[PDB]
Nucleic acid binder design. Structure first.
Lengths: 306, 335
RNA sequence: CUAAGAAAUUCACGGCGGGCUUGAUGUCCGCGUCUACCUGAUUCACUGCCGUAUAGGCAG
């Protein structure tokens, strides 16, 4: 919704047990809503004190590993679980299945404000780093890189370069920093285009079928495979309203009594994993919140991509 | 009236990482940054029926017929190499601040009263005893569990990491420090002071804990076993699956946390077990029995409700237990 | 203010019995690899002498 004055590269963050249950219909990498909420929590905890704004996150996923196993004779997968403590009567409690995964990500935070000129870039980058070093990203702790060969320092780069050549070189070197990874972007326009193509293929087709078709492996007879432009994962695109907006005190057992509570339900959209060299500017990968509370549509997305 | 909060939650303070397992030789523990990792392998086991019979399978003909069918299983096994006798277990520990602050809570008066209760506790005696017991659980190799059982000598090295380097280093003999007695030692008091300062701070204090256990040359080590539900599939599965992060056997983070939480020696039952993990309703998974039952007035919920609502302050040991539960975390609150 | 907040999978195990893989076989005709270059830039920081000297000078 806004152009950042600088990009804050949080370095390789080792996330221990992230919520691999991204949505009621998808598993694997955590939802972009988790990353946007983590960035908003960074702004709420240290961004205000630095007189800056932290909006926009770039997700690169240098390494992924989910605690999953494949049972013998089945082609699907199951989630490895944890042994919860026993009940008060000494019996095993009912198992609630949750997926927990290991990440290694580096985040590009969009920074705009007066604290960029008020404070040195290295100082605010550092203070954001040790602020994030005691937080959670997707339900998992953050490993702070102690006593390895060398830690990766935080680096903030102002987008207003002295020249176009200097800006282009800075963008390419920042891309070289987060090279063993794949940027995560959203493909709502591609999903709608494929849905229109599917509707011309056969009518009364919903966007759920278009989203399923763009992710499944399709086999066509002469036996070939329908190729995909990219990786094309299905991701939760936000939340849609399910109930009228209640007052902060109406809902029993709320998180607090100062915030209105509205029941919602997941919105499923299209996403893409792509190498960071295939983006014009690294600020095009930033994920933003788009609430629009009048009609629900509590959405997160990455605009200005193409 | 100070009604208790409908939604109550506490963040997990004192959270460790996965205990990476690696192997090497004793008297080379200093140059152990390049020690090769312990790998989880596969092997086949053929056993025989040895469980109790249900008075109908005790016929000799049926027993012999069932023995004549071979019992084959595939298990995950982790071993030290045939030229290495020392198992090195390394993990990272973050001691988070804001220890008494709830993560989610409804009632604002309950917020003020609970924060007042924690303030009274911290300016009365603080985390002196709790961090002492946590530093003891760090100093002895309780997080090795079955790896600590038959080791010739165990040494635990704990380093404080401030920016990127060792601000302060510790070295302990884990077998000398008991698993049930919490004495006082100068280095242990320094570690307890650091942990208490981390708990009372606003940021976090980072510790790496490296334990060397002289298991034996080529012996069998015990990483954490993974919980996988069979879910009634027709194919036979592997009976034992071990945990590994990147081709390297590891121990689960919650397993290490349960090892660190074993500080509760104030439960109403006798301390024949010794310390137990700090949990609501005092549950012990190995003993199958939950001490601190709610029929007695020593469970966490009733103690907290009497302490914060009716201002019935419990004993100092029960206050330590309640604050240790606050360190542990959990999702609380009635409907 | 992160489908937020919380969690011990674990004890025990004999996989082995035995075995002939052998029979036969044409790889093969033909072929233009050329042209043109500064290794050397202070590239030998070397040998001896006065002085206890590693402190510091001197000789061709």
């Amino acid at each position: 919704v806004t152009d950042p004055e600088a990009l804050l590269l949080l370095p390789r963050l080792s996330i221990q047990n992230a919520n691999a249950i991204s949505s009621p219909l998808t598993w694997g990498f955590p939802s972009p809503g988790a990353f946007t909420g983590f960035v908003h929590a960074l702004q709420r905890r240290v961004g205000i004190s630095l007189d800056i704004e932290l909006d926009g996150v770039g997700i690169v996923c240098h390494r992924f590993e989910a605690q999953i196993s494949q049972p013998a004779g089945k082609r699907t997968k199951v989630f490895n679980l944890t042994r919860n403590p026993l009940n008060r009567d000494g019996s095993t409690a009912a198992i609630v299945e949750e997926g927990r995964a290991h990440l290694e990500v580096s985040l590009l935070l969009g920074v705009h404000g007066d604290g960029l000129d008020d404070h040195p870039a290295q100082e605010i980058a550092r203070q954001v780093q040790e602020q994030a070093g005691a937080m959670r990203l997707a339900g998992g702790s953050i490993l702070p890189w102690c006593n390895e060969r060398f830690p990766a320092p935080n680096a903030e780069l102002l987008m207003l370069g002295g020249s176009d050549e200097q800006r282009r070189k800075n963008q390419r070197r920042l891309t070289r920093r987060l090279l063993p990874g794949f940027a995560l972007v959203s493909r709502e326009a591609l999903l709608q285009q494929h849905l229109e193509t599917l509707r011309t293929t056969l009518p009364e087709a919903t966007t759920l079928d278009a989203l399923l078709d763009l992710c499944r492996i399709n086999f066509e007879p002469p036996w070939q495979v329908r190729d995909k432009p990219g990786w094309l994962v299905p991701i939760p695109a936000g939340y849609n309203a399910l109930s009228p907006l209640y007052l902060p005190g109406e809902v029993r057992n709320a998180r607090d009594r100062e915030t209105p509570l509205r029941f919602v339900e997941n919105l499923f959209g299209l996403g893409e994993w792509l190498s960071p060299h295939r983006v014009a500017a690294l600020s095009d990968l930033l994920w933003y919140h788009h609430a629009e509370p009048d009609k629900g549509l509590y959405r997160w997305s990455t605009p200005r991509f193409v | 009236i100070l009604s208790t909060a409908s939604v109550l939650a506490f963040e997990r303070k004192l959270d460790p990482s996965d205990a990476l397992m690696s192997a090497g030789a004793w008297a080379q523990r200093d140059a152990s940054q390049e020690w090769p990792a312990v790998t989880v392998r596969e092997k086949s086991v053929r056993g025989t029926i040895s469980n109790r019979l249900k008075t109908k399978d005790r016929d000799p003909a049926k027993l012999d017929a069932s023995i004549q069918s071979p019992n084959l299983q595939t298990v995950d096994v982790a071993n030290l190499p045939s030229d290495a006798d020392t198992l090195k277990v390394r993990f990272t520990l973050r001691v988070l601040g804001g220890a008494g602050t709830p993560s989610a809570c409804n009632d604002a008066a309950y917020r003020d009263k609970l924060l007042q209760t924690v303030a009274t506790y911290v300016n009365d005696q603080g985390f002196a005893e709790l961090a002492r017991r946590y530093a003891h659980n760090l100093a002895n190799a309780r997080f090795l569990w079955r790896n600590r059982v038959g080791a010739e000598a165990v040494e635990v090295r704990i380093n404080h990491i401030r920016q990127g380097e060792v601000a302060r280093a510790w070295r302990f003999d884990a077998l000398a420090i008991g698993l049930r007695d919490f004495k006082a030692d100068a280095e242990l008091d320094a570690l307890a002071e650091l942990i208490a300062s981390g708990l009372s701070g606003s940021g976090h204090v980072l510790l790496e804990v490296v334990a060397f256990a002289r298991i034996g040359d080529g012996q069998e080590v015990f990483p954490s076993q993974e919980l996988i539900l069979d879910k009634g599939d027709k194919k036979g599965q592997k009976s034992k699956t071990l945990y590994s992060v990147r081709d390297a056997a590891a121990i689960h983070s919650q397993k290490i946390g349960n090892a660190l939480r074993t500080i509760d020696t104030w439960y109403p039952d006798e301390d024949g077990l010794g310390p137990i993990a700090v949990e609501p309703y005092g549950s012990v998974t190995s003993q199958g029995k939950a001490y601190r039952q709610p029929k007695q007035k020593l469970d966490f919920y009733t103690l907290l409700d009497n302490w914060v609502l009716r201002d019935e302050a419990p004993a100092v040991e029960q206050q330590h237990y309640v604050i240790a539960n606050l360190i542990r975390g959990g999702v609380f609150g009635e409907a």
